Write a protein that binds this ligand. Structure first.
Ligand SMILES: Nc1ncnc2c1ncn2[C@@H]1O[C@H](COP(=O)(O)OP(=O)(O)O)[C@@H](O)[C@H]1O
Length: 946
RNA sequence: GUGUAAAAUGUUGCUAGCAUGCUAGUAACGUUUUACGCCC
């Protein structure tokens, strides 16, 4: 090669005060002319001159031949480095840390602390939950007897009579209830009401199979309660439904409440995560997520009649756990009746789990449709051409170009034009001419995997305003990012002539459905938001959608029109991929489920997973078991610690509960609730504007001298509190002027309140939960905030990172990374932060480019909060997770890291005796004091500022 | 949803000699360039 072994040589020649290059010297007459280049390199060290003198056709070829030869012999000199470039990287080592730089007073304090605690270091069976039928003077959701009011002296039969007469009066007067009820009767589920209501009483486990859009979600529970109350015993019945999506649960609660024509919370209520509107104790309806039911499971289902668990072919792990537990529930308890619910799937396997349990059928009216593939679209509008980690193995095969040319002009279209990867005017014009010729006014729906490409298609339609003309081509997006106003507007149709273009994702595959849908466009692409435990990676990838989802989309439309299915897939792919989707419970950490089951004293996890729908691979249970045991939360002989009992009630992963323990130990509990709530709830920092690549003046100013997003959101919540002390009307305007996002931080506040309340019931006294307001504008040192930063460092582990330059940062295990756009440390110029160490919250995007929730960390962590186990190395080098280096003599690192037993003993004492957390044992008290002292932000700089 | 002084395959038109051909002088171009604000 000629573009190598010469660039640094030219630089070396420049250092030799030589500006010479390949000088072209013509040789021969105009018929025997040849071009000769000259370039000589002298090496004084070796005194072996090298030169390039080779004839060449063209002036470049004079240099082209000479330079190639010049590389050849000068490389034979064995003096130059090959490729002569700035290529290759080394993950630059500890160019400079702030190694220790503490006063000897701190050294003496640490020595007397470790000698004050004497911690040596080297210096070189299957039970079940209780259940009862409805019982008087007892509430089934609050797990207690009210013993007051009216029920203490009133029988449940009187409650049933009251509910029955209320229903009778409603039938007498409530006319909008009448219209809602023929709306429910004309709904297809109502056809087999009598047989389903008889079978549910006749059968313990009932599986209902009714196609998507049948609307049984809003009606099965209502029918059950009506049947129970028309018999005069509705009061002697509490009905229960869960559902795997919080917003869907809220929507169905609203739908049943409006159909009930009654205020929410009287008979129907919803308990989504971090919220509760619990209804009346008897003859009531509750909706919830699976996690909420798992939390309520501790007391038992005593007093509830039936459970009507929603979607199962979602195949989520929590629903699988719920169903596995509920099978044993009904095996032990015969009176309980269970309703399994699905839309379109082979319920034979689900019945097989329940000993071939009876499965009931709800036939659904549908119109068969024709389907289009590469052949039809190549026939009328062409379909062939292309656009005119880092590596693995195996063999990806692309079937887009693989199609027999017995159809229309494959190669001719290839040579001429189209756009495939990004849908363009071809498909939209095909559907437009379809509308204008077939005269079929219907909604146009397109399903796209990722919100980033959602915005890309929005911008591609907007800039192409000729066919993105909103005034005549209505464009209607649909996702969780956009507010509920747009979702409400989507369900509101607009007059035909102004075509309705709707873009959404797997959220529109279920839950929501428009009666005007005719045009279905599919790309079989969906979000692949998964996690990898072996290296702590979250990938928001996109893989071919499950076939079952493909026929679900195929049957999505066709309300009154027969329906027209436009499939963007090839034959081989359409007949190749599997019908269902891979079980998400196969690739998901089981530590949370393992802790949950181990609190319910349900015996060995291995036996449980053996008696499950799908046995998880043994590596999953092994990794969950080791992640619990080596986290010092489950005893080596499989005995549950009170710490795990605390964790289970916490609706957060143990990586935050373990240290919600410690936050109250250090008197920073409110800030810890804030950080845990915001870290667990993956959301934004502000109401970012559209088309924005950085943060505004105040969006960066709220970071302040600390320059942390965490402290920025903390202070933002602080001003929001001091402004909600005033009215909300101007508060909303002020927060918008601050760019605040309302709902996200409101949820953060509610979660902080719930966490502090739960820590109250844990036994921890209130004084350690007090306000700890911190102002970002001061660059000095406040103990509370640096303690907070240290706990952030220990918490998000192992999400630490090293900043290199600009956005380029280095993360664990030899991977480059950049900063998130929303992160407050984003900019265009080079700004050197006070400390060259950061920690991130989440790693969005597949190729580990964007790190989320960045906050700089004190250099004193190293081993303080840098690993689960002590890391000791040799030759005066400190090993931090085998990817970070510090230069400390072994003894100081040894003593700063030997407090891992100290901290775990502190946590053990705190969970053992929550009542005296403020008044700790005196050696432990001075441990707390000294660790508060050492973790100051500006601590590792004594003796030498820079 | 990056491009530049650098790498070679190679097309044209077109200027002079060597006896309709051959040789040098290229607007331009993927694919391989040191690097620079670049994370979508
Ligand atoms: N605003 C609304 N008005 C009337 N019906 C609605 C409304 N929103 C949702 N629905 C009905 O609620 C039903 C949801 O139940 P479905 O999705 O079939 O069960 P699952 O939630 O288990 O998938 C839909 O079929 C739809 O007809």
């Amino acid at each position: 090669t000629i573009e190598n072994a010469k660039e640094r040589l030219n630089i070396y020649k420049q250092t030799n005060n030589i500006r010479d290059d390949y000088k072209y010297t013509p040789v021969g007459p105009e018929h025997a002319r040849s071009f000769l280049a000259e370039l000589s390199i002298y090496v004084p060290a070796l005194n072996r001159t090298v030169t390039a003198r080779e004839s060449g056709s063209n002036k470049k070829s004079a240099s082209k031949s000479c330079a190639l030869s010049l590389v050849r012999q000068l490389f034979h000199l064995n003096v130059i480095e090959p490729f002569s470039g700035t290529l290759k990287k080394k993950k630059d080592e500890q160019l400079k840390p702030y190694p220790v730089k503490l006063s000897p007073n701190l050294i003496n304090k640490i020595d007397e602390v470790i000698k004050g605690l004497d911690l040596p270091v080297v210096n070189p069976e299957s039970s079940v939950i209780p259940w009862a039928p409805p019982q008087a003077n007892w509430n089934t959701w609050h797990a207690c007897n009210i013993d007051e009011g009216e029920l203490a002296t009133t029988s449940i039969d009187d409650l049933s009579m009251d509910y029955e007469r209320s229903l009778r009066d409603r039938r007498q007067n409530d006319n909008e209830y009448r219209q809602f009820l023929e709306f429910r009767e004309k709904l297809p589920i109502a056809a087999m009401r009598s047989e389903i209501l008889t079978a549910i009483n006749d059968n313990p486990v009932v599986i209902i199979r009714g196609n998507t859009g049948c609307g049984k979600t809003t009606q099965i529970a209502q029918y059950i309660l009506d049947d129970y109350i028309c018999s005069g015993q509705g009061g002697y019945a509490n009905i229960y439904v869960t559902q795997p999506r919080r917003i869907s649960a809220i929507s169905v609660a609203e739908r049943v409440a409006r159909e009930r024509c009654e205020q929410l919370g009287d008979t129907v209520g919803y308990s989504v995560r971090f919220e509760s509107v619990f209804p009346r104790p008897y003859g009531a309806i509750l909706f919830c997520t699976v996690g909420v039911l798992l939390r309520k499971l501790e007391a038992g289902l005593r007093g509830v009649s039936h459970i009507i668990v929603d979607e199962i072919h979602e195949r989520d792990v929590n629903s699988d756990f719920l169903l596995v537990i509920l099978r044993d529930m009904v095996d032990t308890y015969p009176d309980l009746h269970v309703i399994l619910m699905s839309a379109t799937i082979d319920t034979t396997k689900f019945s097989k789990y329940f000993g071939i349990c009876p499965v009931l059928e709800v036939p659904g009216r549908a119109f068969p449709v024709q389907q289009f593939f590469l052949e039809d679209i190549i026939q009328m509008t062409d379909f062939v051409p292309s656009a005119e980690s880092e590596d693995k193995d195996e063999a990806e095969i692309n079937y887009n170009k693989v199609c027999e040319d017995k159809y229309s002009q494959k190669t001719r279209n290839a040579m001429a034009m189209l756009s495939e990867s990004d849908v363009s005017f071809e498909l939209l014009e095909a559907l437009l001419m379809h509308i204008k010729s077939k005269n079929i006014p219907g909604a146009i729906l397109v399903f796209l995997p990722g919100w980033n490409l959602i915005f890309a298609l929005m911008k591609f339609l907007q800039n192409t305003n000729i066919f993105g003309d909103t005034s005549q081509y209505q464009i209607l997006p649909c996702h969780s990012q956009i507010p509920r106003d747009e979702q409400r507007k989507v369900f509101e149709p607009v007059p035909e002539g102004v075509t309705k273009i709707i873009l959404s994702t797997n959220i529109a595959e279920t839950s929501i459905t428009i009666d005007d849908i005719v045009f279905v466009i599919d790309i079989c692409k969906a979000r692949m938001k998964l996690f990898t435990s072996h290296n702590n990676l979250t990938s928001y990838a996109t893989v071919w959608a499950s076939k079952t989802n493909l026929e679900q989309r195929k049957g999505r439309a066709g309300r009154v029109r027969p329906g027209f299915c436009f499939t963007l897939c090839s034959r081989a792919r359409f007949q190749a991929l599997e019908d269902n989707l891979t079980p998400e419970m196969f690739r998901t950490p089981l530590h949370e489920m393992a802790l949950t089951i181990k609190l319910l004293r349900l015996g060995s996890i291995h036996h449980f997973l053996s008696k499950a729908l799908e046995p998880p691979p043994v590596d999953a249970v092994i990794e969950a078991e080791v992640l619990l045991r080596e986290m010092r939360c489950l005893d080596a002989n499989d005995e549950l610690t009170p710490l795990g009992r605390l964790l289970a009630r916490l609706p957060i992963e143990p990586r935050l509960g373990k240290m919600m323990v410690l936050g109250a130990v250090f008197g920073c509990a409110d800030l810890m609730a804030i950080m845990a709530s915001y870290s667990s709830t993956f959301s934004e920092v502000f109401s970012l504007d559209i088309g924005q690549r950085r943060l505004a003046n105040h969006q960066k100013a709220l970071s302040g001298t600390k320059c942390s997003d965490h402290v920025a959101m903390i202070v933002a919540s602080q001003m929001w509190r001091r402004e909600k002390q005033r009215g909300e009307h101007m508060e909303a305007r002020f927060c918008d002027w601050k760019g605040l996002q309302m709902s996200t931080m409101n949820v953060i506040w509610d979660a902080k309140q719930q966490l502090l309340d739960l820590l109250q019931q844990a036994g921890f006294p209130e004084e350690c939960m007090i306000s700890h307001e911190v102002d970002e504008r001061i660059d000095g040192d406040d103990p509370v905030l640096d303690v907070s930063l240290a706990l952030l460092c220990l918490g998000l582990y192992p999400n630490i990172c090293v900043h290199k330059e600009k956005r380029k940062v280095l993360t664990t295990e030899s991977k480059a990374a950049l900063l998130h756009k929303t992160s407050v440390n984003c900019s265009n110029l080079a700004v050197t932060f006070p400390y060259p160490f950061f920690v991130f919250g989440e790693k969005i995007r597949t190729r580990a480019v964007s790190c989320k929730q960045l906050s700089m960390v004190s250099p004193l962590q190293v081993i303080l909060f840098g690993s689960r186990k002590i890391d000791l190395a040799a030759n005066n080098i400190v090993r931090v997770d085998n990817w970070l280096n510090f230069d400390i003599e072994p003894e100081l690192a040894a003593k700063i890291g030997a407090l891992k037993p100290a901290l775990e003993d502190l946590i053990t004492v705190a969970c053992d005796n929550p009542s005296d957390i403020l008044r700790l044992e005196e050696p432990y008290a001075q441990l707390v004091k000294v660790v508060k002292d050492l973790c100051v932000k500006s601590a590792g700089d004594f003796g030498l500022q820079r």
